Amino acid sequence: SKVVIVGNGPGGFELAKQLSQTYEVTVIDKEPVPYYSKPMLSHYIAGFIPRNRLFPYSLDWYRKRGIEIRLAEEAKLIDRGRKVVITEKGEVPYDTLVLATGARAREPQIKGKEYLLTLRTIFDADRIKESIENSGEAIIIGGGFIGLELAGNLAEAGYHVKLIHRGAMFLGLDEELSNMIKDMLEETGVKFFLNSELLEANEEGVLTNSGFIEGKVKICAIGIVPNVDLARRSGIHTGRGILIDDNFRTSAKDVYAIGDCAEYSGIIAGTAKAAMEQARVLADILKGEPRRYNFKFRSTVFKFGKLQIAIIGNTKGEGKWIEDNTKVFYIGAVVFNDIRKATKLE
């Protein structure tokens, strides 16, 4: 059976590894480079690792695994009729198609948006790296993991970092925890502008409700937009993401979707860890081992400079400190710099 996978992010890459010893697997990705770790891109940008350390396996490793890897190749249409994927280089037949098309950075729509950078690919990381090497500074607009990772790693490398954020909540956490994360990153050298909204950007900085912040390098990190256009124009139903059932099946026979592009009951997980877990569960399902991925539960650890933080389950309840570095909810936990305690609470 030919399994074709569009996308070689952590979703598609993990799926391919899990299926290649069993099926005839082809991966199609429009980027000209093999799989690289996105969670490590801030580390690269800040100068802590060489660009090559982002690449865990060479092209020969896809070879050794029996995975046909088609790079610098964009899928234009899915011919469900035939059943083939049409790229610009040609046509790729499938018995099973999995869409792992991921997401793009939400683009800013303000006056002066042409001065704002986003971060999604290694190529964005390269441009951001060269811009902060030219300037010695960055302004970050946002405050999910990408913005805080970036700001934390940049400050730790000794760049001037300014972070502009609406409201005062970070990572969807309560205001106490959000303030603690802020304080810890401040001590590291991050200058925060909370309760602050962008009105416009120009060459030399950004205007907010509460003033003008100087910086020629601005990076916007305000969210993602799932890539659903390939599906949409192939007659596959989409909402915010490609609409899947609890077995990752789309509205189209023989077409599945996983990762940042896939939406199940209003949820897109939005992490590499989730994307890889979905790939594993889908691999089990395709191999006739029924499995029920828990779409609700998230558990992930982020590293913002030296600060490691585990966020586990439901943190939307009322929380209580029971030990050093650990706030639990009564169903969830947040753990600062303690992987051991994070594992046992999960």
Ligand SMILES: Cc1cc2nc3c(=O)[nH]c(=O)nc-3n(C[C@H](O)[C@H](O)[C@H](O)COP(=O)(O)OP(=O)(O)OC[C@H]3O[C@@H](n4cnc5c(N)ncnc54)[C@H](O)[C@@H]3O)c2cc1C
């Ligand atoms: C800076 C940064 C830091 C991050 N840090 C963390 C972290 O610390 N922890 C964490 O869990 N997650 C982190 N993430 C998120 C994680 O990287 C994403 O959740 C993950 O990348 C999603 O994986 P994916 O396989 O679904 O999609 P993607 O990584 O978006 O890959 C989709 C692939 O599909 C390809 N593609 C799309 N359409 C087509 C087409 N039509 N034809 C051919 N190819 C196509 C694209 O080129 C792309 O390679 C971070 C992300 C960024 C950007």
